[PDB]
Amino acid sequence: PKTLTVGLFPYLPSWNENGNEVKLINLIKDVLPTQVSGYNIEYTEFDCYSDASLQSLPDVFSTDSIFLPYLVSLGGVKSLDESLVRGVTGDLHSFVSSSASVNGSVYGFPQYLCSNFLLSSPNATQQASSLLELAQKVGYEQIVYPDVASSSSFTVFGLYQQLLQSSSSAAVDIKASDLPQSGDQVNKDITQKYRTILDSTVVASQREYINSVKQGKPISNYYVGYSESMCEIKDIIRDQQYNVQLIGTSDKPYVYTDVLALNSNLCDEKQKVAVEVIKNLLTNTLVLDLLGLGLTLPANKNGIAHLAKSSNFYAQLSQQFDAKESEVRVLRCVDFANKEVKNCAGVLRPFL
Incomplete structure (x- = not known):
């Protein structure tokens, strides 16, 4: 009855030799907990690059910030406190935090950082x-x-x-x-x-x-x-x-940021459970280490620092x-x- 639907960003790297394809999203999914604070957590792939999926948002979803303001103007995303995000993600860059903020207010937790390097x-x-x-x-x-x-x-x-x-x-x-x-x-x-x-x-x-x-x-x-x-x-x-x-x-360099956000129709208890699931997705060292295997960039400085300690690639970025x-x-x-x-x-x- 009390379950939480999570829409994960499905566009993570994959590996291949011949026939056998290995998706990084599957490796991460098998690490995430399906039972948090009594809630049954459902992890599914949320294609933010599909207009149909943007019409029916889950409880908590990961979307590209390129469609964030348009997603905000539909009301389906809940505005969040500055302190609530900082207490989970830690310190973000100026552009990372700006990409998640719509009209002053904050509308999600930055998850991934992407760009054409x-x-x-x-x-x-x-x-x-x-x-x-x-x-x-x-x-x-x-x-x-x-x-x-x-x-x-x-x-x-x-x-x-x-x-x-x-x-x-x-x-x-x-x-x-x-x-x-x-x-x-x-x-x-x-x-x-x-x-x-x-x-x-x-x-x-x-x-x-x-x-x-x-x-x-x-x-x-x-x-x-x-x-x-x-x-x-x-x-x-x-x-x-x-x-x-x-x-x-x-001239100016452009980056993409994937942002974890929660539906605005959430209660007040689910609102707390979602933050725990998100705090796990962004701070779990095993998830971060797995992201490092696919050269995926975390959005927070803490996440970047964690992967920079043993990777020269992450160090330069x-x-x-x-x-x-x-x-x-x-x-x-x-x-x-x-x-x-x-x-x-x-x-x-x-x-x-």
């Missing part, structure tokens, strides 16, 4: 501060950037808005009235920047890149993607001394997040979600 081989040859700067230097077809090469809807939409909008704060909140609707609304200056980067990317998938690095013959010394996509070579990264940094597609703590931006949506993102991407693609 630059994995540069020791054979660096050339360095840069932004992707545009890097693209010009490396020339035609040098960098590996699978999402851009494949023109993923979420990436096409993202890079366009990153090149376009600019903000003094950390939260770049855009609305549906800022998205190209036809084609004459497509900013040609921004489409120019994207093409510069696309021309510097080799038509090669992430799988092809990982295989090449494993076989000792990298197809490129440059790679852009999520840190979770580098988990299958985390040994080679540590051994052969690969470098990883925060690079903006232009800790220094990175601290040095550029004020320059990091987070793209969020005010009055739209997945449907508009896919539609906007569909408009932009022919102009790329």
Whole structure:
């Protein structure tokens, strides 16, 4: 009767050799307790990248902060005290806490930190501060950037808005009235920047890149993607001394944050049980250690520090997040979600 539904972020890395696929989300799920404070805890996968799932929120769910303000305007998420979050997550970065806050108030506990980092081989040859700067230097077809090469809807939409909008704060909140609707609304200056980067990317998938690095013959010394996509070579990264940094597609660096939030229709007792489940998800050393195996980044400084004590990879990102703590931006949506993102991407693609 008294049960708690938990919607976990399902997009964690996975492993493979041949046929047998191992999902990190399954390893973590088998560690989480199914009985807390007399409550029966149900852990299921919550796809925040599905508009249908955003319509029916569970008791407690993990969602990308890119849809947080839109999720707030529907009322389905409960506002939380500043002290309640700080007593669980500990110290957060300026951009991490900003990505979780909507209109002053806080609406969730930051769980994961994500971004399109630059994995540069020791054979660096050339360095840069932004992707545009890097693209010009490396020339035609040098960098590996699978999402851009494949023109993923979420990436096409993202890079366009990153090149376009600019903000003094950390939260770049855009609305549906800022998205190209036809084609004459497509900013040609921004489409120019994207093409510069696309021309510097080799038509090669992430799988092809990982295989090449494993076989000792990298197809490129440059790679852009999520840190979770580098988990299958985390040994080679540590051994052969690969470098990883925060690079903006232009000027300002952008990151993604996954946030644990609770439904607003919760009682007052369930409200306490949820915090315990969340406090476990964010502070349990076994969960953190498992996240380290997939190169997944915790959102709190405590979580990052814990994994930095035995990983050079996590060490660089800790220094990175601290040095550029004020320059990091987070793209969020005010009055739209997945449907508009896919539609906007569909408009932009022919102009790329």
